[PDB]
Amino acid sequence: MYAALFPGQGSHRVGMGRALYEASPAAKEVLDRAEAALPGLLKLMWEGPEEALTLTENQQPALLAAGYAAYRAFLEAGGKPPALAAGHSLGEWTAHVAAGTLELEDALRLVRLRGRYMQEAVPVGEGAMAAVLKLPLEEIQKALEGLEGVEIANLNAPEQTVISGRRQAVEEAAERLKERRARVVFLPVSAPFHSSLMAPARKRLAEDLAQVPLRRPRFPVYSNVTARPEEDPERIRALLLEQITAPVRWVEILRDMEARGVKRFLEFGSGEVLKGLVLRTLKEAEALSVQDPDSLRKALEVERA
């Protein structure tokens, strides 16, 4: 058994999903359906420009389509579904498509909107995000006390925390954390994701999400908000919206999965970011990224030779 994990922003790359597309009839179908749903998607995914692909509103649907494609390719090759699933930010939607909570086409349309909403929420230059390394969460929280406009956005791994909000507020936090011997690195993003500044985006997505039918997932899917598996459709709808302005509790999801007994984790779609978080967070675990034929076969081997 294993837990399926789906990547979020930053894990995209030109060429994503192409190898699987050529080697898997299942991946091919998913991706074609994606093209039909959002014309021009594949061109962006396979030949860029990588800047254009990086646009939030393109990146999000790209990652979801690639994640689901890789997952279906895995099942087609004889892999079994996961015991549990989770996704980092945008990835949570992908997990839900995998579990059958959302239809692929609806998901793609929704995340393209999510990305667009999110990007135009804050004026360019007024927001920022930064990764804080080598510093325990508690010290980070202590150093952010009294500071306004700055909050925890990602809980990715012990001593790997992302903060975000008003640029000036983030810069000032960076100074404090730096003095605390922490390694601070600003992210290449203009939008302060997972911060109260995303509120505008949430409200707008709520209107679009309202018209979409949700079903009970085939397997439990974790919520970045609660750090717990969720299976009730309307509660799922609520959490997908709350997620937008809440911190991504990645570390707690991983820990909870381990407590449930999961020792193997497969990251679908592209990049090996989540794989890195898994190993850094849970050490006796095994993690692999299924993003191309070679990685796919490797995953199958460990699950069943």
Add this chain to the structure above:
Amino acid sequence: MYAALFPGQGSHRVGMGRALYEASPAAKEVLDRAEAALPGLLKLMWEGPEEALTLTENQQPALLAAGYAAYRAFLEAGGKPPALAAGHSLGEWTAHVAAGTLELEDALRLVRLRGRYMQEAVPVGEGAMAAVLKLPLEEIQKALEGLEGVEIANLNAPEQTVISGRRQAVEEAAERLKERRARVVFLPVSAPFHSSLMAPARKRLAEDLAQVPLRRPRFPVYSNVTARPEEDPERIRALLLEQITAPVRWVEILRDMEARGVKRFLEFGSGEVLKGLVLRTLKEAEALSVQDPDSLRKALEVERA
């Protein structure tokens, strides 16, 4: 006749170079040599954390190592050396190593310093950078007129230009460009790469580079400064330093290559970024990105001896 192209900043990612590492002994040993010169590099490249790898002082060595490794993998497999080579910013260094101008160990140490120097050039927060698509250069220049500390940093594609400079200045230009129907990937907090503001990084690297022997390249290597091939070591040394504050004339380089009679372009290392720029710039031309066994196979099929 093909041209070797080596990627620069932004083409990195957790997992970079791993595929070739375990598939090609030539590539594996370049990277082990890289790890030997810069202890810990491989860990950053493969496990991350991602933000840590993104730090210029890690990102540049990593990109150079992956680039040269892919190239060596290609040559050892019978691939033929290029007629002409070029690299985007950091990539120019990679091209010189492949050309034999300087040794890999020297280059690795030099680009780590280059990355660190750039990182501390301007105080964190006083510099910004933004990528601008959907608009011709002419319009960007116009919109830029009258703006203080903002400059054209990259000429990547006809409608792909990068600007950088003082944070406040870059922002105003961004707002003006968006208004001018342009799309923008804005980095609110970033070293103002390839702007006059990088001067202190240039002055510092000048000492380290002064201590390294340089040789005549086995094949012509373009300079992002002149947008023309260079073969004189004394000039190359000077041009490598001047590059840090000068605009990257990628578009011009590609055009000249086309004029030299180059029909095929091979991008070595990781990512397909340069391939994306070649496509959007030259249309009757062929491009491939050699970053894993499959792409290596295909490159050899069309360019092996």
